[PDB]
């Protein structure tokens, strides 16, 4: 009849504050000139939060910086009813990832 | 040529129409699809169907009828029967509102915006026809809607044509049974409005129909299927003169010109003598003398009027099937000699006899047996005055208490008609005794 | 060929530019990257009304972003579609907004209008024949107003023969946060109405009321509001890109809607917004479509037109329709409230029927009607401006920037002229 | 050669004429869609006079159209098809009756054998239709009618049903690409041989077609359908790599097109003679010979 | 010979052109591919199809039509639909910008630089034409584009060719239904610019077609799949006499000479009597008498004008199928003797009958019937001046307030012409009044 707000977990969102993780990433590019766009991961154990970043690369060309702010990317293995956000328990060397 | 247009207004007319056209199609041999078998009778609309069905270049015998109904339930049912491809689509005029048993609700609030359509139908029949001998109007008086809209359509057809007969059947209000209490009100309203426009209005009663049923049909629990079937066979008999041929012949115009005595009084009664069952006709036997005696037995008529409490003045006998004229005239002479019967002076000749040779037909799975001789009897006698006596000393109490008039006045009516109707009826009964006396 | 180039200005021009372009891209099946994934033949066929076509099947959105603080530009950049935007178009300055209409109109824009004009005429040459440009900005928002006024002023002479369609957010009457907002609005509205032809008026409070009413979700984001407004704009955009019987032209709408030279300000309304259980609790019938379609609550621009009447109205409907239902509903709405329209032009209604449905739900529509429904808005801004100006507070900043009050006088004069014209025509 | 059209809806026989080149007709229609008398009645009549039925318009026939004796030789395939579909009033087309007819005679077996043997000289496994009709009329003493010989030729025809191959289609493709300046498939094929996303072997054609439409590959959708037909399998997942290698024009010759004239037509010049165009071109003996009496040879 | 040229100006003209052409190809069997299999109807390009096609050295039936439009959307959809391959490639003339409901937008801003191309196309058709009876032009008054462009084209072809014929059919704006408050503007502009060149123009109404569709055809949610197929049937009916032969024939020159009484007034009305659906045709009856009665029924018309509010001066019967002169004359004589119709004393007879034997033809996935007797109604009356009073008072208030005039002055319009329009209209008004006077 009448809705109500959902519930949040103070244990998750206060205990391990700004616990962050970093990784390096490679991509497959249409253009042959993009073979080594070494990209960086950043994970937050606050809301299973994910962000991705690009370091400036000296004199090789491509501008660096930010490709996407912190995002609750729903897992490609997370159906429309079940919102997983690529639980970091899956990340491993040479993993398989598809976002946007 | 020789054709009549059928009109059925109502709750009260749908099932009887269903039965009668089922009998029609059965007897002419129409397949309920509509066409003939490999026999060659489809044509330019001119063979035995040229009187009832408009079989046209499409090869389908199309009934020349219009049903108009206020409450779409039953008409949807009749379209969801089996003969729907037979019947004509917009000859089935349906509405969305009942007349709610109120004469004036039927005649004023809803009816007027339907007469345009019904007139369009009847005129598009009037253009095609050439003989247009008249109409067969089916309604009732104890009808929630068959009263007022029927009166209005009668008025318009009277004012546009006064050059064709007007035949009316009616299931009359039961004398002592009254399903509705608005029955006396709307019934007398219908009567006093229709007296000065109706050519031949005839009656029959459900109670006496049932009495015949459990008397000699050996049916203690009959139904509508049965009642409507009986009335349909009656009308089939009265139209047999039109359909088939015979030695001597009469027409509905002759009926009017030769049964009603005077102005006003044109409400006679009817009967069908050989009402028996399978085994009864099997090991029994009918013949002209006893069919005459039975058709004039006081109980066999379908209204509770004792002839010995009245006096005969007119009789029309229709015999159908094989017969010789000798016994016919001899038996009617013997009945003339009879001492229990009563003839007034005016009618030394009072017997209109009409013969058709073709036997009456049966309906499959029905009640009536095979028929060798049959008769339709149409008699007019003074006896029926007592029924109107009953109706008036009924209505007088309701008027004394001004009961139920609030509905009519609130939907917009005034005392004028309510007053007038009583002395209209009173003039009717006074004329009844004035002519009954000598 | 006819096509449109988009301009997004101010820190909410960012808001809506992001939401609007992403909505259209999702409608057209272009991935966030750009590699077109052709699944609707018609939209592939007519993509050129918005998009140029590049190699391998990516499509630049011919849209240009303008702001002052690089952080907001980088945020929208970081959005899921900043990659489908342009490093080309990423022109921007170095100063701070100061939320200052005066600085924006005279100091900050004086070194940005040049470059942005170069870019816009570059794109205009690049394409064949615009119908015009849609500009999404704010009137209360400081730098959006400061930029957009000058930009439209110059493009007016740049091309006197095209469509200068403008989209503006009305400050919340209950609160403007920024207290100089009435001053900015009175400054802007003058040049706005003077230069433009068609302006959209939207306010945040009514969208919040919708969110309470049928969204009922109780945890809204301005992003959800942007989602709504993106659908709103898409509704009027669908006509050109789509086949079937429909007069698509914005100039068609202009000549069918605008009775007088100086009538420009119009108010939107839109069609089924599906509630908690209405998905399976709502039968999609032209009666109920029109029922909600012409309703006071679902209206979300300014304020109940219950007080006023409707000068003229126009409605476009997306889906498989026929003319008889819209026709008969027009009869019913005219005969129901014979007074609620102006006698000034009988049969004041226009219809349009896009054959193409949206992707997912069968029937939708867009409403747009011009009415005497802005009197209360600018009378409100009148009382605010008068009450704050009578003691000329918060004015030494503007004196330092180089202003004076004669322009304030003439602005309020023109605005009161608008009030009088509305009142004398309708009343 | 006159158009006589039998209208089965009105029993009328339309007589129309086509203009010829440098001759003496300049005519055309002759009989306005009219029911016409049987040419076997009187002027004085008592009973219902008769009219031409559909019973006697058999192939190779005589007829009168109120005076003029018309003779009838040839027929069109659609008329033939409707002819054999329902044979109650058309027993002529029923070939099995001719089977019994020729099965009645037995003595002529070896005689037919040597006659047909000497007809050929190389055993080329075909035979000219004129020779066929002559020898069959001979064996029937001139008692067979045209129609059933036509039908039996139709049945035991030689099979020669072919279609244009890929050679034309690829040549036209090459030249169209030449016209469309976008000749270089360096811009397209390399982009594709990247853009294959999740591939091990072959790919659904619904992807190739859609990426073509996306890239605006210069071609008509009709030729798109034609080539996709010419390169397909049960699942429509062809080897896209060779698909693109062959559609590329890094090696090709260059033919071109003729007229669309009207010569191999049937109001223009092919043969318009007694073997009017040609019903069935060629036909072979041995099958029909075996079906008649071909015993004491091979299996029979 | 007997061949005509079709012009389809505008968004609306080109679509109903597609629909009617989809009709045309069937009754001569032309396939969506435009080539028959082996059978022969080809020749010297000279036989029944030669009225509308010219099947040239490639055996392709080529429409004798032209399609000019401003917005390329619909010409694109028909360049991608089912019939683009048969439609001749560059006949289908497309633009890039609309007309924006402004008359002067199509008459001063766009139509100038396209008229050259279109006149060149029509001349390189006229050369290969021999008989060239005339031009069937389709525009629309409230045309969201076509009105202004049609004005210019019509006036120039009139002035350059003052000897051949011009016939105009156009969907007429509704009495009360609105799609454009600007519609009165371009309606009156087109009228006062066209009444002095148009030979005869014929108006119908979408609402009226719809009303027919849900009274008799039983279509409760039509579109103009349905109603365009109806109008296509209408034009096929008027051109059947051209196509086929028969007892006695009729021609557009006769229409020009004999329908219109006087200069200026050349506005008749059109109707099709036996509009009827599947089951009604299947199992009901049609003949000349009732179909004539129906076509003279006052509500069957495509424009709401009351014949009792009017008076007739001309009628044209187009009887197609199996009809015969005796019943033709009997029906028309009965209609004459009937008194509801009130003919003026100008023409003691008011009838022009035309015969064709070939029945009309059905279309797959359609609504029409296997009708053997059809009749096209083309009648000129006096009931219509009410509509012009309607339009002028629908216009006068709105001009007196001068809404949207800024648009027209901005695109380069002044007000002398707008002034002139209403006295042209009042001229037509008093003209109808005076010709009615007797
Ligand atoms: N005429 C006729 N009457 C019947 C039949 N069966 C019962 N009746 C009686 O006929 C009456 C029908 O009258 P109404 O019900 O008023 O009929 P109506 O006015 O046409 O309309 P409704 O009230 O809506 O059905 C009932 O009161 C019954 O007493 C029948 O088969 N035929
Ligand atoms: N995307 C986005 N836009 C917002 C949001 N909240 C408010 N806005 C509004 O967008 C308005 C217009 O911003 P701009 O047009 O960029 O104004 P400006 O001239 O740059 O300077 P300011 O008015 O100080 O922002 C602001 O005044 C805000 O009121 C939000 O939460 N998200
Ligand atoms: N002939 C035709 N008429 C249509 C079609 N669809 C809608 N209509 C009718 O077209 C009429 C209006 O035409 P207009 O709006 O003036 O169109 P236009 O001025 O030629 O140009 P557009 O901007 O393309 O619409 C209406 O009366 C509709 O009944 C169609 O496909 N064909």
mmCIF file of N, CA, C and O in Angstrom, chain C residues 1-2 46 242-243 245 247 249 251-252 254-261 321-325 327-328 330-331 343-350, chain E residues 71-74 76-77 96-98 100-101 105 144 176-182 207 210 220-224 394 398 401-407:
data_model
loop_
_atom_site.group_PDB
_atom_site.id
_atom_site.type_symbol
_atom_site.label_atom_id
_atom_site.label_comp_id
_atom_site.label_asym_id
_atom_site.label_seq_id
_atom_site.Cartn_x
_atom_site.Cartn_y
_atom_site.Cartn_z
ATOM 1 N N UNK C 1 19.309 18.999 -46.473
ATOM 2 C CA UNK C 1 18.666 18.228 -45.418
ATOM 3 C C UNK C 1 18.571 19.087 -44.161
ATOM 4 O O UNK C 1 19.367 20.001 -43.964
ATOM 5 N N UNK C 2 17.577 18.802 -43.329
ATOM 6 C CA UNK C 2 17.323 19.547 -42.107
ATOM 7 C C UNK C 2 17.953 18.825 -40.924
ATOM 8 O O UNK C 2 17.815 17.606 -40.792
ATOM 9 N N UNK C 46 17.563 8.009 -40.636
ATOM 10 C CA UNK C 46 17.426 9.441 -40.393
ATOM 11 C C UNK C 46 18.288 9.950 -39.239
ATOM 12 O O UNK C 46 17.977 10.993 -38.655
ATOM 13 N N UNK C 242 11.070 10.850 -37.801
ATOM 14 C CA UNK C 242 10.211 9.688 -37.896
ATOM 15 C C UNK C 242 9.229 9.821 -39.055
ATOM 16 O O UNK C 242 8.804 10.928 -39.394
ATOM 17 N N UNK C 243 8.851 8.703 -39.684
ATOM 18 C CA UNK C 243 7.928 8.759 -40.824
ATOM 19 C C UNK C 243 6.470 8.861 -40.412
ATOM 20 O O UNK C 243 6.164 9.093 -39.240
ATOM 21 N N UNK C 245 2.222 10.175 -41.125
ATOM 22 C CA UNK C 245 1.529 11.459 -41.078
ATOM 23 C C UNK C 245 1.959 12.206 -39.829
ATOM 24 O O UNK C 245 1.589 11.843 -38.715
ATOM 25 N N UNK C 247 3.109 16.644 -39.211
ATOM 26 C CA UNK C 247 3.829 17.886 -39.456
ATOM 27 C C UNK C 247 4.895 18.020 -38.381
ATOM 28 O O UNK C 247 4.590 18.333 -37.227
ATOM 29 N N UNK C 249 7.702 20.040 -38.412
ATOM 30 C CA UNK C 249 8.529 21.235 -38.385
ATOM 31 C C UNK C 249 8.294 22.062 -37.125
ATOM 32 O O UNK C 249 7.155 22.345 -36.736
ATOM 33 N N UNK C 251 9.092 25.147 -37.126
ATOM 34 C CA UNK C 251 8.471 26.330 -37.712
ATOM 35 C C UNK C 251 6.979 26.112 -37.931
ATOM 36 O O UNK C 251 6.181 27.049 -37.808
ATOM 37 N N UNK C 252 6.587 24.882 -38.268
ATOM 38 C CA UNK C 252 5.169 24.549 -38.313
ATOM 39 C C UNK C 252 4.511 24.826 -36.968
ATOM 40 O O UNK C 252 3.479 25.505 -36.894
ATOM 41 N N UNK C 254 5.586 26.791 -34.709
ATOM 42 C CA UNK C 254 5.657 28.221 -34.446
ATOM 43 C C UNK C 254 4.500 28.957 -35.103
ATOM 44 O O UNK C 254 3.833 29.778 -34.466
ATOM 45 N N UNK C 255 4.236 28.661 -36.375
ATOM 46 C CA UNK C 255 3.197 29.399 -37.079
ATOM 47 C C UNK C 255 1.814 28.917 -36.668
ATOM 48 O O UNK C 255 0.824 29.637 -36.840
ATOM 49 N N UNK C 256 1.712 27.709 -36.120
ATOM 50 C CA UNK C 256 0.431 27.243 -35.614
ATOM 51 C C UNK C 256 0.183 27.635 -34.167
ATOM 52 O O UNK C 256 -0.951 27.518 -33.695
ATOM 53 N N UNK C 257 1.206 28.104 -33.457
ATOM 54 C CA UNK C 257 1.088 28.389 -32.038
ATOM 55 C C UNK C 257 1.161 29.867 -31.701
ATOM 56 O O UNK C 257 0.371 30.337 -30.884
ATOM 57 N N UNK C 258 2.074 30.607 -32.321
ATOM 58 C CA UNK C 258 2.458 31.933 -31.850
ATOM 59 C C UNK C 258 1.542 32.989 -32.454
ATOM 60 O O UNK C 258 1.700 33.352 -33.627
ATOM 61 N N UNK C 259 0.587 33.514 -31.686
ATOM 62 C CA UNK C 259 -0.386 34.445 -32.272
ATOM 63 C C UNK C 259 0.194 35.809 -32.588
ATOM 64 O O UNK C 259 -0.224 36.443 -33.563
ATOM 65 N N UNK C 260 1.141 36.285 -31.788
ATOM 66 C CA UNK C 260 1.647 37.643 -31.882
ATOM 67 C C UNK C 260 3.165 37.649 -31.940
ATOM 68 O O UNK C 260 3.807 36.652 -31.602
ATOM 69 N N UNK C 261 3.762 38.755 -32.394
ATOM 70 C CA UNK C 261 5.233 38.844 -32.397
ATOM 71 C C UNK C 261 5.885 38.475 -31.072
ATOM 72 O O UNK C 261 6.823 37.671 -31.058
ATOM 73 N N UNK C 321 -1.836 5.372 -33.890
ATOM 74 C CA UNK C 321 -3.140 5.988 -33.664
ATOM 75 C C UNK C 321 -3.919 6.119 -34.963
ATOM 76 O O UNK C 321 -3.425 5.826 -36.051
ATOM 77 N N UNK C 322 -5.150 6.601 -34.818
ATOM 78 C CA UNK C 322 -6.002 6.987 -35.926
ATOM 79 C C UNK C 322 -6.627 8.330 -35.597
ATOM 80 O O UNK C 322 -6.588 8.792 -34.455
ATOM 81 N N UNK C 323 -7.204 8.968 -36.609
ATOM 82 C CA UNK C 323 -7.660 10.332 -36.392
ATOM 83 C C UNK C 323 -8.967 10.394 -35.623
ATOM 84 O O UNK C 323 -9.283 11.435 -35.042
ATOM 85 N N UNK C 324 -9.772 9.336 -35.646
ATOM 86 C CA UNK C 324 -11.118 9.502 -35.118
ATOM 87 C C UNK C 324 -11.086 9.708 -33.615
ATOM 88 O O UNK C 324 -11.877 10.485 -33.079
ATOM 89 N N UNK C 325 -10.182 9.021 -32.915
ATOM 90 C CA UNK C 325 -10.171 9.116 -31.462
ATOM 91 C C UNK C 325 -9.688 10.484 -31.001
ATOM 92 O O UNK C 325 -10.294 11.090 -30.108
ATOM 93 N N UNK C 327 -9.925 13.142 -32.800
ATOM 94 C CA UNK C 327 -11.007 14.017 -33.224
ATOM 95 C C UNK C 327 -12.131 14.053 -32.195
ATOM 96 O O UNK C 327 -12.552 15.128 -31.747
ATOM 97 N N UNK C 328 -12.624 12.882 -31.803
ATOM 98 C CA UNK C 328 -13.764 12.836 -30.899
ATOM 99 C C UNK C 328 -13.389 13.353 -29.521
ATOM 100 O O UNK C 328 -14.199 14.016 -28.865
ATOM 101 N N UNK C 330 -11.270 15.692 -29.060
ATOM 102 C CA UNK C 330 -11.286 17.136 -29.244
ATOM 103 C C UNK C 330 -12.701 17.679 -29.110
ATOM 104 O O UNK C 330 -12.927 18.684 -28.424
ATOM 105 N N UNK C 331 -13.665 17.028 -29.762
ATOM 106 C CA UNK C 331 -15.064 17.421 -29.585
ATOM 107 C C UNK C 331 -15.454 17.424 -28.113
ATOM 108 O O UNK C 331 -16.070 18.379 -27.622
ATOM 109 N N UNK C 343 -12.254 32.597 -26.418
ATOM 110 C CA UNK C 343 -13.084 32.738 -27.605
ATOM 111 C C UNK C 343 -12.295 33.396 -28.729
ATOM 112 O O UNK C 343 -12.719 33.369 -29.891
ATOM 113 N N UNK C 344 -11.130 33.953 -28.391
ATOM 114 C CA UNK C 344 -10.349 34.792 -29.290
ATOM 115 C C UNK C 344 -9.998 34.060 -30.581
ATOM 116 O O UNK C 344 -9.869 34.686 -31.638
ATOM 117 N N UNK C 345 -9.843 32.742 -30.517
ATOM 118 C CA UNK C 345 -9.703 31.902 -31.705
ATOM 119 C C UNK C 345 -10.368 30.550 -31.456
ATOM 120 O O UNK C 345 -9.819 29.690 -30.753
ATOM 121 N N UNK C 346 -11.570 30.339 -31.984
ATOM 122 C CA UNK C 346 -12.232 29.043 -31.810
ATOM 123 C C UNK C 346 -11.434 27.928 -32.463
ATOM 124 O O UNK C 346 -10.746 28.134 -33.465
ATOM 125 N N UNK C 347 -11.532 26.734 -31.874
ATOM 126 C CA UNK C 347 -10.823 25.548 -32.360
ATOM 127 C C UNK C 347 -9.309 25.740 -32.248
ATOM 128 O O UNK C 347 -8.559 25.502 -33.193
ATOM 129 N N UNK C 348 -8.869 26.146 -31.066
ATOM 130 C CA UNK C 348 -7.502 26.572 -30.798
ATOM 131 C C UNK C 348 -6.518 25.412 -30.614
ATOM 132 O O UNK C 348 -5.455 25.610 -30.008
ATOM 133 N N UNK C 349 -6.840 24.221 -31.103
ATOM 134 C CA UNK C 349 -6.083 23.011 -30.802
ATOM 135 C C UNK C 349 -5.413 22.479 -32.065
ATOM 136 O O UNK C 349 -5.992 22.520 -33.158
ATOM 137 N N UNK C 350 -4.177 21.999 -31.918
ATOM 138 C CA UNK C 350 -3.433 21.370 -33.005
ATOM 139 C C UNK C 350 -3.036 19.953 -32.612
ATOM 140 O O UNK C 350 -2.687 19.699 -31.453
ATOM 141 N N UNK E 71 8.699 17.998 -48.406
ATOM 142 C CA UNK E 71 9.409 17.260 -47.371
ATOM 143 C C UNK E 71 9.776 15.887 -47.896
ATOM 144 O O UNK E 71 8.880 15.142 -48.321
ATOM 145 N N UNK E 72 11.043 15.491 -47.849
ATOM 146 C CA UNK E 72 11.461 14.267 -48.541
ATOM 147 C C UNK E 72 11.091 12.988 -47.805
ATOM 148 O O UNK E 72 11.377 11.895 -48.297
ATOM 149 N N UNK E 73 10.441 13.105 -46.647
ATOM 150 C CA UNK E 73 10.186 11.934 -45.812
ATOM 151 C C UNK E 73 9.296 10.913 -46.517
ATOM 152 O O UNK E 73 9.658 9.738 -46.653
ATOM 153 N N UNK E 74 8.114 11.336 -46.960
ATOM 154 C CA UNK E 74 7.192 10.375 -47.552
ATOM 155 C C UNK E 74 7.633 9.952 -48.945
ATOM 156 O O UNK E 74 7.415 8.801 -49.343
ATOM 157 N N UNK E 76 10.616 9.486 -49.645
ATOM 158 C CA UNK E 76 11.583 8.459 -49.277
ATOM 159 C C UNK E 76 10.890 7.153 -48.910
ATOM 160 O O UNK E 76 11.333 6.073 -49.317
ATOM 161 N N UNK E 77 9.818 7.224 -48.119
ATOM 162 C CA UNK E 77 9.171 5.983 -47.703
ATOM 163 C C UNK E 77 8.566 5.259 -48.900
ATOM 164 O O UNK E 77 8.525 4.025 -48.926
ATOM 165 N N UNK E 96 13.457 19.694 -49.971
ATOM 166 C CA UNK E 96 14.196 19.620 -48.719
ATOM 167 C C UNK E 96 13.573 20.422 -47.584
ATOM 168 O O UNK E 96 13.952 20.212 -46.426
ATOM 169 N N UNK E 97 12.633 21.321 -47.869
ATOM 170 C CA UNK E 97 12.040 22.180 -46.853
ATOM 171 C C UNK E 97 10.533 22.200 -47.040
ATOM 172 O O UNK E 97 10.037 22.006 -48.152
ATOM 173 N N UNK E 98 9.809 22.439 -45.950
ATOM 174 C CA UNK E 98 8.354 22.364 -45.958
ATOM 175 C C UNK E 98 7.747 23.651 -46.515
ATOM 176 O O UNK E 98 8.443 24.538 -47.018
ATOM 177 N N UNK E 100 5.131 24.973 -44.329
ATOM 178 C CA UNK E 100 4.863 25.570 -43.021
ATOM 179 C C UNK E 100 3.472 26.192 -42.927
ATOM 180 O O UNK E 100 3.276 27.180 -42.217
ATOM 181 N N UNK E 101 2.501 25.642 -43.656
ATOM 182 C CA UNK E 101 1.105 26.077 -43.676
ATOM 183 C C UNK E 101 0.927 27.495 -44.197
ATOM 184 O O UNK E 101 -0.211 27.973 -44.265
ATOM 185 N N UNK E 105 4.557 31.069 -48.321
ATOM 186 C CA UNK E 105 5.792 30.304 -48.214
ATOM 187 C C UNK E 105 5.959 29.379 -49.411
ATOM 188 O O UNK E 105 7.058 29.252 -49.964
ATOM 189 N N UNK E 144 -1.194 21.058 -45.432
ATOM 190 C CA UNK E 144 -0.110 21.570 -44.613
ATOM 191 C C UNK E 144 1.057 22.079 -45.434
ATOM 192 O O UNK E 144 1.907 22.817 -44.930
ATOM 193 N N UNK E 176 -16.523 21.818 -38.481
ATOM 194 C CA UNK E 176 -16.234 22.083 -37.080
ATOM 195 C C UNK E 176 -14.963 21.433 -36.551
ATOM 196 O O UNK E 176 -14.512 21.810 -35.465
ATOM 197 N N UNK E 177 -14.373 20.478 -37.263
ATOM 198 C CA UNK E 177 -13.158 19.806 -36.815
ATOM 199 C C UNK E 177 -11.959 20.576 -37.343
ATOM 200 O O UNK E 177 -11.942 20.988 -38.511
ATOM 201 N N UNK E 178 -10.954 20.770 -36.490
ATOM 202 C CA UNK E 178 -9.842 21.660 -36.787
ATOM 203 C C UNK E 178 -8.515 20.930 -36.664
ATOM 204 O O UNK E 178 -8.294 20.187 -35.704
ATOM 205 N N UNK E 179 -7.643 21.150 -37.646
ATOM 206 C CA UNK E 179 -6.231 20.816 -37.547
ATOM 207 C C UNK E 179 -5.340 22.043 -37.675
ATOM 208 O O UNK E 179 -4.126 21.933 -37.474
ATOM 209 N N UNK E 180 -5.910 23.197 -38.019
ATOM 210 C CA UNK E 180 -5.133 24.420 -38.188
ATOM 211 C C UNK E 180 -6.068 25.614 -38.101
ATOM 212 O O UNK E 180 -6.958 25.760 -38.943
ATOM 213 N N UNK E 181 -5.882 26.460 -37.086
ATOM 214 C CA UNK E 181 -6.533 27.763 -37.088
ATOM 215 C C UNK E 181 -6.099 28.615 -38.268
ATOM 216 O O UNK E 181 -6.784 29.585 -38.608
ATOM 217 N N UNK E 182 -4.964 28.286 -38.888
ATOM 218 C CA UNK E 182 -4.517 28.992 -40.080
ATOM 219 C C UNK E 182 -5.234 28.493 -41.330
ATOM 220 O O UNK E 182 -5.151 29.136 -42.384
ATOM 221 N N UNK E 207 -14.617 13.502 -42.031
ATOM 222 C CA UNK E 207 -15.602 13.109 -41.029
ATOM 223 C C UNK E 207 -16.755 12.370 -41.677
ATOM 224 O O UNK E 207 -17.260 11.393 -41.123
ATOM 225 N N UNK E 210 -15.857 8.906 -42.483
ATOM 226 C CA UNK E 210 -15.854 8.160 -41.228
ATOM 227 C C UNK E 210 -17.267 7.804 -40.775
ATOM 228 O O UNK E 210 -17.525 6.675 -40.329
ATOM 229 N N UNK E 220 -15.416 0.684 -36.801
ATOM 230 C CA UNK E 220 -15.470 1.542 -35.625
ATOM 231 C C UNK E 220 -14.151 2.238 -35.343
ATOM 232 O O UNK E 220 -14.147 3.265 -34.656
ATOM 233 N N UNK E 221 -13.038 1.718 -35.858
ATOM 234 C CA UNK E 221 -11.746 2.402 -35.782
ATOM 235 C C UNK E 221 -11.067 2.400 -37.151
ATOM 236 O O UNK E 221 -10.009 1.795 -37.334
ATOM 237 N N UNK E 222 -11.646 3.092 -38.137
ATOM 238 C CA UNK E 222 -10.993 3.198 -39.449
ATOM 239 C C UNK E 222 -9.631 3.871 -39.394
ATOM 240 O O UNK E 222 -9.186 4.406 -38.378
ATOM 241 N N UNK E 223 -8.968 3.834 -40.552
ATOM 242 C CA UNK E 223 -7.973 4.822 -40.957
ATOM 243 C C UNK E 223 -8.187 5.129 -42.433
ATOM 244 O O UNK E 223 -9.197 4.730 -43.041
ATOM 245 N N UNK E 224 -7.247 5.829 -43.054
ATOM 246 C CA UNK E 224 -7.471 6.048 -44.468
ATOM 247 C C UNK E 224 -6.779 5.027 -45.341
ATOM 248 O O UNK E 224 -6.807 5.177 -46.557
ATOM 249 N N UNK E 394 -16.290 32.283 -39.829
ATOM 250 C CA UNK E 394 -15.185 31.673 -39.102
ATOM 251 C C UNK E 394 -13.908 32.480 -39.298
ATOM 252 O O UNK E 394 -12.984 32.402 -38.481
ATOM 253 N N UNK E 398 -11.481 36.484 -36.562
ATOM 254 C CA UNK E 398 -10.059 36.214 -36.420
ATOM 255 C C UNK E 398 -9.223 37.195 -37.229
ATOM 256 O O UNK E 398 -8.135 37.582 -36.787
ATOM 257 N N UNK E 401 -9.211 40.637 -35.332
ATOM 258 C CA UNK E 401 -8.152 40.660 -34.331
ATOM 259 C C UNK E 401 -6.745 40.467 -34.899
ATOM 260 O O UNK E 401 -5.773 40.796 -34.210
ATOM 261 N N UNK E 402 -6.612 39.955 -36.123
ATOM 262 C CA UNK E 402 -5.328 39.800 -36.821
ATOM 263 C C UNK E 402 -4.327 38.950 -36.036
ATOM 264 O O UNK E 402 -3.271 39.414 -35.602
ATOM 265 N N UNK E 403 -4.679 37.680 -35.865
ATOM 266 C CA UNK E 403 -3.763 36.713 -35.281
ATOM 267 C C UNK E 403 -2.852 36.131 -36.354
ATOM 268 O O UNK E 403 -3.300 35.793 -37.453
ATOM 269 N N UNK E 404 -1.565 36.032 -36.028
ATOM 270 C CA UNK E 404 -0.497 35.428 -36.824
ATOM 271 C C UNK E 404 -0.083 36.268 -38.024
ATOM 272 O O UNK E 404 0.868 35.890 -38.717
ATOM 273 N N UNK E 405 -0.745 37.396 -38.287
ATOM 274 C CA UNK E 405 -0.400 38.228 -39.436
ATOM 275 C C UNK E 405 1.065 38.637 -39.429
ATOM 276 O O UNK E 405 1.627 38.946 -40.490
ATOM 277 N N UNK E 406 1.694 38.668 -38.254
ATOM 278 C CA UNK E 406 3.111 38.995 -38.187
ATOM 279 C C UNK E 406 3.937 38.001 -38.981
ATOM 280 O O UNK E 406 4.904 38.383 -39.645
ATOM 281 N N UNK E 407 3.570 36.720 -38.929
ATOM 282 C CA UNK E 407 4.252 35.719 -39.742
ATOM 283 C C UNK E 407 4.241 36.106 -41.213
ATOM 284 O O UNK E 407 5.277 36.075 -41.891
#
